[PDB]
Amino acid sequence: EVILLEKVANLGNLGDKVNIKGGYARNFLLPQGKATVATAENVAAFEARRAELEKAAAEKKAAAEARAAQLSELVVTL
RNA sequence: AUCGCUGUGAAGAUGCAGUGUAUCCGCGGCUAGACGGAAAGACCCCGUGAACCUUUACUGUAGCUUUGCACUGGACUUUG
């Protein structure tokens, strides 16, 4: 009953509409910018924004390339 | 207009009966009677009366506790 928008999770899709538990929509999926309820108020507004998502969602692993190269140097002094 | 006695009597009499005493009226005292006064007996019984206490009386119930379903999610596994 939700529209998923991210894929780096355990079961996060982007174009499948799944039926999940009621508390899993309320407290996690909706308030994190990660879904919206299956309403027909902007369901045709999703279809005019299908090519704005293909920019930032692809750099999401590309900006995690060189940022990860300073995460494993282990240069924190205790 | 308020005596004793002995009987009688709702069964212990100033008042009935019979009979003895006894002029009329205070004051001071004493308490034997007036089943003296005081409190619609406290004991006892009664009431399909009450109240409050008790419990292993009856019926409940606050509180405590158990599980089901809500609030309440994902993710692998032991597992059917």
Strand B neighbours among A 33-72, CB < 7 A: none
DSSP result, A3-70? -----SSSS--SS------HHHIIIIITTTTS--BS-TTSTTTGGGSTTTHHHHHHHHHHTTTTSGGG
Experimental technique for the deposited model: cryo-EM
User: What's at A63, amino acid-wise?
Assistant: A
Give the CA-to-C1' distance from A24 to B19 in angstroms.
Answer: 125
CA distances from A34 to A4, A44, A69, A75, A76 (A): 6, 18, 28, 35, 34
